[PDB]
Design an enzyme around this catalytic site. Structure first.
Site, mmCIF file in Angstrom:
data_model
loop_
_atom_site.group_PDB
_atom_site.id
_atom_site.type_symbol
_atom_site.label_atom_id
_atom_site.label_comp_id
_atom_site.label_asym_id
_atom_site.label_seq_id
_atom_site.Cartn_x
_atom_site.Cartn_y
_atom_site.Cartn_z
ATOM 1 N N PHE A 95 24.444 41.230 2.744
ATOM 2 C CA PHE A 95 24.487 42.395 3.617
ATOM 3 C C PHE A 95 23.483 42.233 4.753
ATOM 4 O O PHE A 95 22.303 41.948 4.514
ATOM 5 C CB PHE A 95 24.206 43.684 2.839
ATOM 6 C CG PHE A 95 25.333 44.119 1.931
ATOM 7 C CD1 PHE A 95 25.401 43.681 0.615
ATOM 8 C CD2 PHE A 95 26.304 45.001 2.386
ATOM 9 C CE1 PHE A 95 26.426 44.096 -0.222
ATOM 10 C CE2 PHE A 95 27.330 45.426 1.553
ATOM 11 C CZ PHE A 95 27.391 44.973 0.247
ATOM 12 N N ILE B 14 25.202 50.333 -4.348
ATOM 13 C CA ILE B 14 24.924 49.348 -5.395
ATOM 14 C C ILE B 14 23.422 49.247 -5.625
ATOM 15 O O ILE B 14 22.604 49.525 -4.739
ATOM 16 C CB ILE B 14 25.492 47.953 -5.085
ATOM 17 C CG1 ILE B 14 25.106 47.508 -3.670
ATOM 18 C CG2 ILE B 14 26.994 47.892 -5.317
ATOM 19 C CD1 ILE B 14 25.566 46.098 -3.340
ATOM 20 N N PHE C 51 33.904 41.910 4.368
ATOM 21 C CA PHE C 51 34.776 42.846 3.675
ATOM 22 C C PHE C 51 34.504 44.301 4.031
ATOM 23 O O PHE C 51 35.338 45.157 3.722
ATOM 24 C CB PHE C 51 34.665 42.655 2.150
ATOM 25 C CG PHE C 51 33.286 42.886 1.600
ATOM 26 C CD1 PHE C 51 32.890 44.151 1.206
ATOM 27 C CD2 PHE C 51 32.392 41.839 1.459
ATOM 28 C CE1 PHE C 51 31.627 44.374 0.700
ATOM 29 C CE2 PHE C 51 31.125 42.052 0.941
ATOM 30 C CZ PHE C 51 30.744 43.324 0.567
ATOM 31 N N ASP C 52 33.374 44.603 4.672
ATOM 32 C CA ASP C 52 33.039 45.972 5.045
ATOM 33 C C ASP C 52 31.980 45.935 6.138
ATOM 34 O O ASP C 52 31.117 45.053 6.154
ATOM 35 C CB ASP C 52 32.539 46.774 3.834
ATOM 36 C CG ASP C 52 32.549 48.277 4.072
ATOM 37 O OD1 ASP C 52 33.355 48.761 4.895
ATOM 38 O OD2 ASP C 52 31.737 48.975 3.430
ATOM 39 N N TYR D 87 25.444 48.453 8.820
ATOM 40 C CA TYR D 87 25.483 47.329 7.896
ATOM 41 C C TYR D 87 26.765 46.539 8.084
ATOM 42 O O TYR D 87 27.780 47.054 8.560
ATOM 43 C CB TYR D 87 25.373 47.780 6.434
ATOM 44 C CG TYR D 87 26.618 48.450 5.898
ATOM 45 C CD1 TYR D 87 27.628 47.708 5.284
ATOM 46 C CD2 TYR D 87 26.785 49.826 5.999
ATOM 47 C CE1 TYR D 87 28.770 48.321 4.793
ATOM 48 C CE2 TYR D 87 27.923 50.443 5.511
ATOM 49 C CZ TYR D 87 28.909 49.688 4.908
ATOM 50 O OH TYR D 87 30.041 50.305 4.426
ATOM 51 N N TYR E 209 28.870 44.403 -7.762
ATOM 52 C CA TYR E 209 30.074 44.829 -8.461
ATOM 53 C C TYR E 209 30.346 44.080 -9.773
ATOM 54 O O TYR E 209 31.414 44.271 -10.364
ATOM 55 C CB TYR E 209 31.263 44.733 -7.508
ATOM 56 C CG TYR E 209 31.045 45.636 -6.324
ATOM 57 C CD1 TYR E 209 30.300 45.216 -5.227
ATOM 58 C CD2 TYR E 209 31.538 46.925 -6.321
ATOM 59 C CE1 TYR E 209 30.078 46.059 -4.146
ATOM 60 C CE2 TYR E 209 31.333 47.755 -5.255
ATOM 61 C CZ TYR E 209 30.595 47.332 -4.175
ATOM 62 O OH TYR E 209 30.395 48.193 -3.119
#
Length: 108
Positions: free
Chosen positions: A100, A57, A37-38, A27, A83
């Site tokens: 994502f 999430i 961010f990830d 991902y 979030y």
């Protein structure tokens, strides 16, 4: 809103994750402006989670369950499914819609 699922590449179209199965994914997570961010891909290690255990999430729980094995898809997730008002300090701002890119590699 909840989670929107937009296909990128098709999977088998037959095998969908069920509660209790382990989803093995690559991902990339981005903010709405496109900032990454990830990413599991940058670590060169797939990410594993068990569906229904709230290890990810809510947008992932409901969104990945809509994907077939081998599918890559774009999940756009509103803050209520993400979030929320709080966000995550220095990573995810308040009230953030996240995008994502997710590939469901296999189920264990």
């Amino acid at each position: 809103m909840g989670v929107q699922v937009e296909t990128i590449s098709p999977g088998d179209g037959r095998t969908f994750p069920k509660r209790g199965q382990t989803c093995v994914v690559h991902y990339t997570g981005m903010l709405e402006d496109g900032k990454k961010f990830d990413s599991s891909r940058d670590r060169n290690k797939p990410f594993k989670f068990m569906l229904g255990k709230q290890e990810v999430i809510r947008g992932w729980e409901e969104g990945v369950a809509q994907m077939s094995v081998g599918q890559r898809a774009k999940l756009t997730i509103s803050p209520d499914y993400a979030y929320g008002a709080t966000g995550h300090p220095g990573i995810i701002p308040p009230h953030a819609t996240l995008v994502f890119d997710v590939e469901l590699l296999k189920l264990e």
